[PDB]
Design a protein around this ligand. Structure first.
Ligand SMILES: Nc1ncnc2c1ncn2[C@@H]1O[C@H](COP(=O)(O)OP(=O)(O)OP(=O)(O)O)[C@@H](O)[C@H]1O
Ligand SMILES: Nc1ncnc2c1ncn2[C@@H]1O[C@H](COP(=O)(O)OP(=O)(O)OP(=O)(O)O)[C@@H](O)[C@H]1O
Ligand SMILES: [Mg+2]
Ligand SMILES: [Mg+2]
Lengths: 251, 745, 222, 86, 91
């Protein structure tokens, strides 16, 4: 006997998350309403028109068992009901993995073909068949209650106009958290990466949080707020674990 | 303009006051300009008397459009009315680049006869404004042999002219200059690529990669937790240090390694010595002679093809390669013959030289020539006369095709005869209806394959969707193999047609997935090859992930073809991620020698030339189509449709066809005296500059390196400073730099 | 603006064509982790669900009478139970050793496949899968530092032949120390980019764990 | 000094610097400075140029960047406390 | 003219000489005599060279006119490793 060898490089999932999937149409330039854009727009339409005719012809002569709604129905039959939720412990092979159910019992089950294999990572929540425990799906993890705490869902109502006298301070903070996103070309044409970090320091009440609130009001990026005292945890390693998770949500 | 305005907005304009048009507003003329094109199509031939005031407006609308930077709308006007000619008279110095850059981008989608016509007007503008280097680029795209001479000799600045020979030599088109032309010698020397070896060797000396590489350093078996193995490592050896001239495995006591191979393994192992001396015509010939006297049948014939590989891509004045191999094209042993024609095909690919062709033509008609020899002669003659529509080769290739038997055409080596005919008409277009009529008389199913293949090579790099429409219909009807052999060519056809512009190529990737889903085995075995052709030396993740999932497929050919496609997609890129995948695939396919041979073949290709070479058929900002490179690629991938019998069989020397497609991904900036001139340049991903006015950046995510740097696919280069004015805007290959008079004022 | 009316007409058709294509091909769900249908081998999956039985993960504890022709294996099936079982006939007796995880069926619990040792998912995530974008050319003023770093951590793996011939055992450890910002992690990022062997990044604060002996466990599994 | 000039060359490689940026002089203006400070000096030097709507970083911009990073930010410098540890 | 032909030869880049060098000789002489003098005229060793003229290898026995050479013909010099007899005798 010889150990199975994976064809996938590594054990981690694909970095890309939340893409356009197969709707990634080519980026047509220029955006101006001209004939070249019209020619490119027709060009994309032409291939789709070919695509529609080609796919229809195959499915027309495809067997009644092999149909888009029939195969989807067969997938549900293969998955079954209920759909147990487990934990991915190890990816032994491309189509084999070690999973553990909620009772703590591990199983050496087979990852079925319809499973999104690039969402598979150790520790992820996997969906298993009730009977044969085979991997039949991956549970899109719900937003952690820890995520909701950091995220400021609604931007604060404090603007830069509500700040008086911190003209230089606004200008310095804008250039590291606002300008790099609004006008990233300024940094690229200069060849400089934007100032990495920023710290606001001074006497109490001087407007440190207020400028951050103004930053959160006029930001297109996700804003995560954590007070430093919230990093003191009641258990060993949890504090380091929390700092690790905070920047994981940021990623 | 408030309502529909059908034959009204122009009418009161036409009949009313004839004052200056812009006095009524920019938005008014824009609607007015949109009208004059709409009514132009409606007007028939009998309505020629109705365009007298219609013409007057466009002589004023175009000058109005260029005044307010609304230049791209000006091209949109006279392209619709098919009157692009009058643009050049009103082109100013402040917008000549913007007008050219726009309509040249439309040449990838507008069909004939507006295809050439739009280029001709752009050609006229560049000729008018004395922008010779970009005028020559347009001429080659139109494959106007006559116009190339006129563009070349019109210029008087000799410094400007040597730059063209670099561009002309890179495209592989030869010009026979007159001795009366000043600086005749170096002009030929530059375009004949005789100095390419020294320039290539001097480059890598600056990159300090002269150290030879063993296949073990590529394999990295020490991190891993036979005749095929030895023959596989021969390719991996030659590919890694191709055109480098030094090898720790063949030059150093090559007899033990060369004889470690067996049967046809020694054929490719011996020929691999000519690939490490690629472009080294003088020095490379000095090394193959030791194996040229070998008593074994394969070694000499392998050394025969090695000379052709050595002289491939280099055109010297006085011809060695024909001499060493002419005496063996009728040699009684087919293997001795076999190493000859494929040697001549690579040695003179894209030459259209009647000397080699007439010497090679009777070989295919010989009684002693087997079908294996018959195929390579069509392949080779196709490379010499690629895209030339040579009348002589068409007659004999057709003659051979119908003279063969019904059972003879069943052999997969017979598939090569159509490619030779297809190669001759590479990119020619509709010049095949006479040829396609001749293919009617030949028997089935070979006729369907031959009809599909030659039609595909006709429209190579054209993007003609109507032709791709036919190709998908051929793929539509499935057959429950023998009758569906032609289906693989149609899939390779879609890539060969859509490889023109980016929009079509990416739009073809999704259609490749559907053939990869609804397809049948013989239809699904070729779509990995289409991915390789459509994106060779372009290791984009979408194709690689698509190929990665399908490397371990149930169908052996799909597994074999997909892995090879990964290597060709990353050919010469030295991609760290791809090498990791190929190393992992080696572990998975350890117990499958056939799959592992494909994995080993891919590992050699991704480290081709130590990352200093590319197989992409496109250069000049991915706008110029190289006839020789497509011939080299097409030879390999069309041979991969029968990967069981040809590549994995006794005929793996066909993998040396991509030698014709080997070029260095080069940026070497030369002084006016052709000496090296290292300066700071900015290398980064190209950005489309069509549309937006002003000065938009054409590179993003760029970095600053010295000049002798290897440019990856899709990476443009701009000079960081203004110390030197490039002769040509396109900063690829060898570039001549001139001191800027305004600089250091 | 003259093409504005026609551009939206073809843009909407493309969107309508795109949605129509998704109707036949199928681009949906993605919340139960369903792969695109291009990778769906339903015929094979049905065969796997019958031909390939599921195997429960168990650890061998003792082999009884290994010398004889009736070797009996005591297995610990996680939290389920402990069973004295015999080996399956499609695996070799020499392939199962005491203390090694095995895969057992649900009916007679006979060992069907040996399994890799259990590793903490956190420890598994410690190995670098995407190399950094930093090379040694991005480290300046550390010429002597890098050569010492490379000849211990890079040279032995790249060219091991130069050390075995001379009977040399190269050092197996390097400590990089200096004030913050001096390039300690920068050089290690260059090492991971250039290295071909497995690279595992372990931050010391990651080894601090809530429970007693857990931090030492992760070092053992690492 | 040689190492600091080398780090300056590394981080100012992709910058849009002027003709005669005296990188040896800039390396001399920060005697005991980590490579992290040198990178920030390069970033702030181009950051002053962005401030002035200028596409090329002059030598004065680097001189101001050295003052802001090496001199003004010397209160928070971790170097003096950590050389005793190393 | 007067029984002497203009033979332009090519030299390898290792011998850093003028690659556009001119060789003058009779036509009644043979290939064996030719190979000797090309070595002398540009400082080379005759035992380790092949000559090719009119895109066909210089057959040493056959005389020039019966070889097929003509006026303003172009030639080259190929450096050799191991002699033609030595290479055959090697294995
Ligand atoms: N410069 C200012 N302009 C306008 N309002 C200000 C300014 N400085 C402080 N304030 C007001 O003071 C309030 C409280 O100050 P803030 O929360 O910003 O303090 P801080 O600077 O973060 O200090 P700390 O957290 O140390 O107490 C703000 O909500 C804001 O309305
Ligand atoms: N020798 C160097 N050459 C070039 N850049 C350097 C050099 N040393 C540091 N840098 C730059 O400074 C940054 C400092 O980060 P780095 O990871 O090197 O710090 P460190 O020495 O590990 O610090 P700490 O002890 O706080 O962890 C690097 O990311 C790099 O951009
Ligand atoms: Mg506060
Ligand atoms: Mg660190």
């Amino acid at each position: 006997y010889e150990p199975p060898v994976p064809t996938r490089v590594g054990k981690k999932k694909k970095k890309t998350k939340g893409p356009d999937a197969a709707s990634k149409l080519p980026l047509v330039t220029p955006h101006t309403q001209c004939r070249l854009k019209l020619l490119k727009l027709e060009r994309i339409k032409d291939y789709l028109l070919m695509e529609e005719e080609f796919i229809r012809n195959q499915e027309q002569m495809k067997p009644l068992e092999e149909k888009q709604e029939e195969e989807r129905s067969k997938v549900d039959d293969l998955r079954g009901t209920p759909m147990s939720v487990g934990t991915l412990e190890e990816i032994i092979d491309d189509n084999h993995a070690i999973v553990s159910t909620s009772v703590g019992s591990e199983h050496y089950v087979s990852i079925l073909s319809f499973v999104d294999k690039d969402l598979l990572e150790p520790g992820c929540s996997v969906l298993l068949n009730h009977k044969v425990h085979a991997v039949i799906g991956v549970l899109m993890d719900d937003t952690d209650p820890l995520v909701t705490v950091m995220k400021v869902e609604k931007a604060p109502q404090e603007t830069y106009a509500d700040i008086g006298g911190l003209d230089n301070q606004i200008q310095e903070i804008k250039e590291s958290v606002e300008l790099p996103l609004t006008h990233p070309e300024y940094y690229e044409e200069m060849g400089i990466k934007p100032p990495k970090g920023v710290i606001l320091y001074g006497p109490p009440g001087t407007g440190k949080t207020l400028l951050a609130k103004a930053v959160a009001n006029q930001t297109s990026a996700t804003f995560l707020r954590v007070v430093g005292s919230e990093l003191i945890q009641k258990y060993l390693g949890d504090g380091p674990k929390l700092v690790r998770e905070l920047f994981r949500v940021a990623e | 303009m408030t309502m529909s305005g059908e034959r009204e907005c122009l009418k009161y304009r036409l009949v009313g006051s004839q004052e200056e048009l812009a006095s009524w507003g920019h938005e008014y003329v824009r609607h007015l300009a949109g009208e004059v094109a709409k009514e132009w199509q409606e007007l028939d031939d009998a309505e020629k008397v109705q365009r007298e005031p219609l013409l007057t407006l466009v002589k004023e609308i175009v000058p109005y459009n260029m005044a307010h930077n609304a230049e791209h709308e000006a091209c949109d006007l006279l392209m619709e009315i098919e009157q692009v000619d009058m643009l050049e008279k009103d082109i100013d110095e402040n917008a000549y680049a913007k007008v050219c850059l726009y309509l040249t981008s439309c040449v990838n989608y507008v069909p004939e006869p507006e295809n050439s016509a739009l280029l001709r007007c752009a050609l006229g503008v560049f000729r008018k404004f004395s922008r010779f280097p970009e005028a020559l680029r347009l001429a080659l795209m139109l494959n106007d042999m006559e116009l190339v001479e006129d563009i070349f000799t019109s210029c008087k600045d000799v410094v400007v002219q040597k730059q063209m020979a670099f561009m002309l030599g890179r495209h592989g088109v030869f010009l026979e200059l007159s001795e009366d032309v000043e600086e005749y010698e170096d002009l030929t020397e530059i375009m004949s690529n005789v100095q390419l070896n020294s320039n290539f060797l001097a480059l890598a000396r600056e990159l300090d990669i002269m150290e030879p590489k063993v296949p073990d350093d590529i394999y990295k078996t020490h991190l891993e937790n036979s005749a095929r193995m030895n023959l596989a490592s021969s390719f991996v050896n030659g590919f890694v240090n191709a055109a480098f001239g030094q090898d720790k495995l063949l030059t150093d006591d090559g007899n033990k390694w060369l004889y470690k191979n067996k049967d046809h393994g020694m054929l490719s192992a011996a020929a691999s010595l000519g690939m490490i001396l690629l472009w080294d015509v003088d020095g490379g010939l000095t090394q193959i002679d030791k194996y040229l006297y070998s008593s074994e049948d394969y070694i000499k014939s392998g050394a025969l093809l090695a000379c052709g590989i050595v002289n491939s891509g280099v055109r010297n004045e006085c011809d060695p390669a024909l001499a060493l191999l002419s005496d063996y094209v009728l040699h009684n042993s087919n293997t001795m013959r076999l190493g000859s024609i494929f040697g001549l095909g690579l040695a003179y690919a894209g030459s259209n030289r009647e000397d080699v062709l007439t010497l090679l033509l009777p070989v295919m008609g010989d009684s002693k020539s087997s079908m294996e020899v018959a195929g390579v002669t069509a392949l080779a003659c196709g490379m010499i006369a690629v895209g030339s529509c040579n009348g002589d080769v068409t007659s004999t290739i057709l003659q051979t095709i119908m003279e063969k038997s019904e059972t003879e055409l069943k052999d997969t080596y017979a598939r090569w005869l159509p490619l030779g005919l297809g190669l001759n008409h590479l990119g020619k277009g509709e010049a095949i209806e006479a040829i396609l009529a001749a293919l009617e008389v030949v028997s089935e199913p070979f006729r369907s394959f031959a009809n599909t293949l030659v039609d595909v090579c006709a429209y190579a790099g054209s993007g003609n969707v109507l032709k791709v429409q036919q190709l998908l219909h051929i793929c539509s009807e499935h057959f429950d193999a023998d009758m569906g052999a032609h289906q693989g060519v149609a899939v390779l056809g879609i890539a060969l047609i859509a490889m023109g512009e980016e929009i079509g190529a990416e739009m073809a990737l999704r259609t490749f997935g559907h053939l990869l889903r609804y397809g049948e085995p013989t239809l699904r075995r070729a779509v990995p090859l289409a991915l390789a052709l459509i994106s060779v030396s372009n290791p984009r993740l979408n194709i690689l992930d698509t190929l990665s999932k399908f490397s371990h497929d149930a169908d052996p050919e799909v597994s074999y073809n997909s892995i090879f496609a990964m290597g060709m997609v990353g050919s010469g890129t030295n991609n760290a991620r791809l090498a990791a995948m190929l190393r992992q695939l080696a572990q998975y396919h350890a117990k499958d020698p056939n799959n592992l041979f494909m994995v080993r073949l891919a590992q050699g290709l991704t480290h081709l030339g130590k990352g200093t070479l590319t197989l992409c058929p496109y250069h000049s900002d991915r706008q110029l189509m190289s006839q020789v490179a497509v011939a080299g690629l097409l030879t390999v991938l069309v041979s991969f449709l029968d990967v069981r019998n040809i590549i994995l069989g006794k005929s793996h020397y066909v993998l040396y066809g991509l030698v014709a497609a080997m070029q260095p991904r080069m940026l070497v900036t030369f002084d006016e005296e052709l000496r090296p001139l290292p300066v700071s340049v900015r290398v980064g991903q190209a950005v489309d500059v069509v549309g937006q006015a002003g000065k938009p950046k054409t590179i993003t995510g760029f970095q600053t390196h010295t000049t002798p740097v290897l440019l990856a696919h899709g990476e443009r280069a701009e000079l960081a400073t203004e110390e030197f004015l490039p002769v040509t805007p396109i900063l690829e290959g060898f570039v001549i730099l001139r001191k800027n008079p305004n600089y250091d004022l | 603006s003259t093409y504005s009316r026609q551009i939206k007409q073809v843009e909407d058709d493309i969107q309508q064509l795109l949605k129509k294509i998704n109707e036949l091909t199928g681009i949906k769900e993605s919340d139960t982790g369903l792969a695109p249908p291009a990778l769906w081998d339903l015929a094979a999956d049905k065969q796997t669900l019958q031909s390939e039985q599921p195997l429960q993960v168990a650890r061998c504890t003792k082999i009884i009478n290994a010398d004889s022709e009736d070797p009996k294996y005591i297995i610990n099936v996680k939290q389920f139970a402990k069973f004295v079982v015999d080996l399956s006939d499609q695996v070799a007796p020499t392939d199962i050793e005491e203390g090694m995880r095995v895969g057992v069926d649900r009916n007679k619990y006979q060992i069907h496949i040996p399994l890799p040792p259990k590793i903490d998912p956190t420890v598994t995530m410690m190995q670098v899968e995407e190399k950094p974008d930093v090379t040694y050319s991005d480290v300046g003023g550390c010429k002597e530092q890098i050569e010492k770093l490379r000849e211990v951590v890079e040279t032995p793996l790249l060219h091991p032949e130069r050390f075995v011939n001379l009977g040399i055992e190269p050092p197996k450890g390097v400590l990089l120390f200096g004030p913050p910002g001096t390039g300690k992690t920068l050089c290690a990022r260059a090492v991971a980019n250039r290295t071909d062997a497995c690279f595992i990044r372990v931050i010391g604060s990651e080894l601090v764990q809530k429970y007693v002996g857990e931090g030492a466990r992760m070092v053992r599994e690492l | 000094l040689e190492g600091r000039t080398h780090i300056f060359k590394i981080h100012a490689r992709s910058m849009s610097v002027e003709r005669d940026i005296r990188f040896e002089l800039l390396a001399r203006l920060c005697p005991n400075s980590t490579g992290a400070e040198i990178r920030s000096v390069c970033t702030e030097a181009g950051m002053f140029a962005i401030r002035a709507r200028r596409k090329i970083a002059t030598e004065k911009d680097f001189l101001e960047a050295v003052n802001k990073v090496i001199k003004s930010y010397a209160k928070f410098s971790a170097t003096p406390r950590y050389m005793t540890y190393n | 003219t007067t029984g002497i032909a203009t033979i332009e030869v090519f030299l390898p880049p290792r011998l850093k000489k003028d690659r556009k060098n001119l060789l003058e000789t009779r036509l009644h002489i043979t290939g064996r005599e030719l190979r000797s003098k090309i070595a002398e005229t540009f400082g080379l060793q005759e035992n380790y060279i092949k000559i090719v003229i009119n895109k066909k290898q210089l057959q040493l026995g056959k005389t020039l006119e019966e070889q097929g050479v003509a006026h303003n013909v172009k030639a080259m010099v190929l450096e050799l490793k191991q002699s033609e007899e030595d290479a055959r005798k090697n294995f």
